[PDB]
Design a protein around this nucleic acid. Structure first.
Lengths: 166, 135, 70, 128, 120, 88, 74
RNA sequence: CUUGAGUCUCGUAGAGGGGGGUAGAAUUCCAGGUGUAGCGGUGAAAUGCGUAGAGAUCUGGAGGAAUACCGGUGGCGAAGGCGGCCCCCUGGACGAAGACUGACGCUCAGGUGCGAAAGCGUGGGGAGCAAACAGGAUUAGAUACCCUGGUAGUCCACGCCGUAAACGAUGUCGACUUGGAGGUUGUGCCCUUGAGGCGUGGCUUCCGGAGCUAACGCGUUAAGUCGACCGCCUGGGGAGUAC
RNA sequence: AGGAUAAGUGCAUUAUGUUUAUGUGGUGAUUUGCCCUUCUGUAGCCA
């Protein structure tokens, strides 16, 4: 269904896992939940929360929901250089234009999420729901173009077709 | 300038009053910047309900044009008139004081739905054989 | 209700299943309750509104066959 | 089914003809047969026939009221009939069915329903 | 390659049958109603159709096999006429939307059909 | 509403005497003339508020066009406001 | 050949037939059932024009004793 | 200057306001005539009414709010607001040609002005319905439920802080952005001749694309892209009350 | 209703019905992640 960036070989960064219930006679819930962010170890889009009858299916649901069945805004190369704010399904991440590479600091499990996402180069504060199941959206709302490549000639990139169109 | 297609009906015993009232309305219209487009008297007619008893009344369609000033003077007279049992008068927005698809239905009313009396000699004086007389 | 003219010289019926002028057709939708001035316009006047569902019913029969959900 | 009434067979005003009136409500029907120039020749009701509740307005309760009056008015000796119906209350045909079993020819169902030109504001009673 | 333009006109001259209502997002290729029936612009569709029929030609040397999808209780006979081969595959009446990603199941039911078809 | 014959007095007397209705001096004179028809009505009962909303439009605008007129030609301005007894 | 614009007797079936009027019993009566009374717009199949005006014209008429307003005359 | 706005006659729709006019029907009532026992109420019922002749019904009068139906996703107003229909006065909108001025614009602290309803000061009106109050009926009780009587009220006119769930639960107006169609209306072109098609506006509404939302949903009358300026908010309970 | 020619035809408690008494508070077996297949399930392409 939903198409994503390039990768070669994938890392199943499971950041969190949980269990749901509402057990009763006839129709019931008894499954497990799992949360994974999928990437290549530098920068890729993809985030999936899924659930199933047991722990093996729970994780396979989650890895499918990252890679398909999910709306994302795209990335190019494993680095950011279009730092801007945004909103996707209430979740707000703000990034002011500053240095690339160095300055990276974010608490709890989030510094590890940012390394597979490609936006550990430029980053600033989060607002809206502050839970690690929904704020991993960094490379989506915090990137409002479909490519943000590492050559600074990116701002001449669309220009070279526009003045040839003149 | 404004058009008021005024139609009214009058009680039988009172129908004598109408030939005079219309001729006082025509001289105030033609005397001050309006027109009588057609002035049709319809004769005596069968009601669909007896008003003030008796199941017949006598109908007149005046087909008036008059300015805002003039129509204001005819209408305060007509509204406090006593011979009229009831009236309905229409607006300048798509008014039809000239030619209608009630041409057949008027002839019918005089022809077939009338009652022949002394009040009804007066019905022919009401819009065709006009004499100045009453209010 | 029976309405003033509907059958050719009555028999043992009165044929009230058949004809009506306009005898309450905008003014009554709820019984055992007080009347209002502005409310009737959306509360009581649903005659057009109930025609949308009669149209849908002649529509949904064909579509159930094409889907073969019949 | 019935309660006391006039006779089927004797003589009173000897009129030969009448008009009948059915006053139909949500709870009762009043059926009163009258003279054709305007004077009552007999009456019944569905409650005076031994019905109560919602059942007092059903078509079979409207029937037995109508067959009750229709018996009585033969002492005044009707032979032909015309009918008025006046209400939105149930079984406006079942009362006619009884008048024709009393031997009458039914001559128009002339609607003169008692509905006003809106009239008065109706009882608060219930909440919907 | 005027040959694509003949077929578009030859097909297009049924002038519609449906009411004067149309999909807003198709508006460019739609000519004005004649008495409450929709009429496509016939000339404005003839430049599109020639671009399409050359692109289909280029993939013929890439081609594996073709799959006619969108079949339903009125469109099937029109797909029957299109295929003229088993180099190109179709169904007659209905189609179950999606096969491409749950191929795992789909190949497992093809093996159940042909085993039990040979026993029968 | 404004008669044709009240409009004809106003056109002849103020602005240019061939069908000028749009110039600021004459536009004032028209609005004034509909105020006068409205003040004839308000000698009846005094719940005539759905027309008063409309009076307030006509007054305010008339007053805007007099602010424009005193920024321009001073003869037109002192004549107009004094000859029609405006700003009350 | 010929045309007519914003006037009577052409478009629809005719624009001089139930324009706005009420003084004729017959234009109203094409649209009145045998009990002497107005029926729904589905029944009457009046042009859109003819109905927004027929809503005023049937009341005008009833009130001028052209139609029997009431149930003792229906 | 018009590219923004403002204006004149012509043409078109409507329950906008204020004051005039006007028809008919139930309940209610009186009278005369006829005629006999229940009527009413309800899921069943008693309370109530009635043998002093009730109920129903014929004829005629009465009296006052209301005005069914066409009536509808309709239409009008400044939001709330406005319902028989018309006139008289008059506001506001909606089209279109001739002609006219030329930023006279936008927003709006302050501000004056303005009521859905009841409340309400004084006046008119009170037929029906109805808070209370009475009494039934309901029931682990019955102030709630459901009923009957029944008074103020409801109903009008002007007036008082305009109160609120004062509405698109959505500030104003204005520019810009794929449309399609219903209801319904000015008007250009067609055998106006199919509530019809095409040219071009109009309000009012369904549907849905780019976009916007947490979700429903919105989407050319935005909840899109925006623009200026104003109003207002910064967790709950307590409190929209206190001071 | 001009006309009842039972014409002008399109529905029937005018569909939106529902007194039917009530019973304190919190907690709970598909698991320590001390987590089976990611496998063309992404423009390259893999368990």
């Amino acid at each position: 269904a939903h198409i994503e960036k390039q990768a070669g070989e994938l890392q199943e960064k499971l950041i969190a896992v949980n269990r749901v219930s509402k057990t009763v006679k006839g129709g019931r819930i008894f499954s497990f939940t799992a949360l994974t962010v999928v990437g290549d170890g530098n920068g890729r889009v993809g985030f999936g929360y899924g659930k199933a009858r047991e722990v093996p299916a729970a994780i396979q649901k989650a890895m499918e929901k990252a890679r398909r069945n999910m709306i994302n805004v795209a990335l190019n190369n494993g680095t950011l250089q279009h730092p801007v704010k945004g909103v996707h399904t209430g979740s707000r991440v703000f990034m002011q234009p500053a240095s690339e590479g160095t300055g990276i600091i974010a608490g709890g499990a989030m510094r590890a999420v940012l390394e597979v996402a490609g936006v550990h180069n430029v980053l600033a504060k989060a607002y809206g729901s502050t839970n690690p199941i929904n704020v991993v959206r960094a490379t989506i709302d915090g990137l409002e173009n479909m490519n943000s490549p590492e050559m600074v000639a990116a701002k001449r990139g669309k220009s070279v077709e526009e003045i040839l169109g003149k | 300038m404004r058009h008021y297609e005024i139609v009214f009906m009058v009680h039988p015993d009172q129908s004598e009053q109408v030939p005079g009232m219309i001729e006082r309305y025509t001289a105030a219209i033609t005397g001050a910047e309006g027109k009588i487009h057609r002035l049709e008297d319809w004769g005596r007619r069968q009601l669909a309900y007896p008003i003030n008893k008796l199941h017949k009344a006598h109908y007149v369609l005046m087909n008036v044009e008059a300015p805002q000033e003039v129509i204001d003077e005819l209408e305060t007279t007509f509204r406090f008139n006593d011979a009229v049992i009831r009236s309905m008068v229409m607006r300048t927005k798509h008014a039809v004081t000239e030619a209608s698809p009630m041409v057949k239905a008027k002839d019918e009313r005089r022809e077939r739905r009338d009652d022949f009396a002394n009040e009804t000699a007066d019905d022919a004086e009401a819009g065709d054989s006009e004499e100045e007389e009453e209010e | 209700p029976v309405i003033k003219v509907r059958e050719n010289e009555p028999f043992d019926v009165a044929l009230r299943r058949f004809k009506r002028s306009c005898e309450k057709a905008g003014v009554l939708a709820e019984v055992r309750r007080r009347e209002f001035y502005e409310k009737p316009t959306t509360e009581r006047k649903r005659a057009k509104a109930s025609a949308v569902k009669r149209h849908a019913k002649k529509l949904a029969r064909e579509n159930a066959r094409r889907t073969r959900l019949y | 089914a019935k309660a006391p009434i006039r006779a089927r067979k004797r003589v009173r005003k000897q009129v030969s003809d009448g008009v009948a009136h059915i006053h139909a409500s949500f709870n009762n029907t009043i059926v009163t047969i009258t003279d054709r120039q305007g004077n009552a020749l007999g009456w019944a009701t569905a409650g005076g026939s031994g019905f109560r509740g919602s059942r007092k307005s059903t078509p079979f309760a409207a029937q037995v009221a109508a067959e009750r009056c229709a018996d009585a008015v033969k002492e005044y000796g009707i032979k032909n009939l015309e009918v008025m119906v006046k209400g939105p209350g149930p079984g406006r045909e079942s009362t006619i069915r009884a008048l024709n079993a009393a031997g009458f020819r039914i001559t128009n169902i002339t609607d003169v329903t008692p509905i006003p030109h809106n009239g008065c504001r109706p009882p608060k009673k219930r909440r919907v | 390659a005027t040959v694509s333009m003949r077929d578009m006109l030859k097909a297009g001259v049924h002038f519609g049958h449906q009411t004067r209502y149309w999909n807003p997002k198709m508006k460019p290729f739609i000519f004005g109603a004649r008495n409450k029936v929709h009429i496509i612009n016939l000339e404005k569709t003839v430049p599109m159709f020639n671009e399409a029929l050359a692109e289909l030609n280029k993939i013929a040397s890439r081609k594996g096999k073709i799959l006619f999808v969108g079949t339903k209780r009125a469109a099937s006979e029109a797909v029957k006429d299109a295929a003229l081969s088993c180099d190109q595959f179709f169904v007659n009446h209905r189609w179950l939307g999606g096969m491409l990603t749950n191929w795992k199941t789909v190949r497992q039911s093809i093996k159940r059909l042909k085993d039990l078809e040979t026993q029968s | 509403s404004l008669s044709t014959e009240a409009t004809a007095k106003i056109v002849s007397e103020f602005g240019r005497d061939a069908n000028d209705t749009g110039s600021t001096e004459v536009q004032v004179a028209l609005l004034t003339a509909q105020i006068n028809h409205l003040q004839g009505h308000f000698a009846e009962h005094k719940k005539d508020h759905h027309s008063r909303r409309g009076l307030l439009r006509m007054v305010s605008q008339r007053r805007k066009l007099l602010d424009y007129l005193k920024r321009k030609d001073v003869a037109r301005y002192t004549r107009l406001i004094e000859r029609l007894g405006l700003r009350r | 050949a010929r045309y007519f614009r914003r006037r009577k007797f052409c478009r629809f079936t005719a624009e001089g037939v139930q324009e706005i009027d009420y003084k004729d019993i017959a234009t109203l009566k094409n649209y009145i059932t045998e009990s002497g009374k107005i029926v729904p717009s589905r029944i009457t199949g009046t042009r859109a024009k003819y109905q927004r005006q027929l809503a005023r014209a049937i009341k005008r008429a009833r009130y001028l004793s052209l139609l029997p307003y009431t149930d003792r005359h229906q």
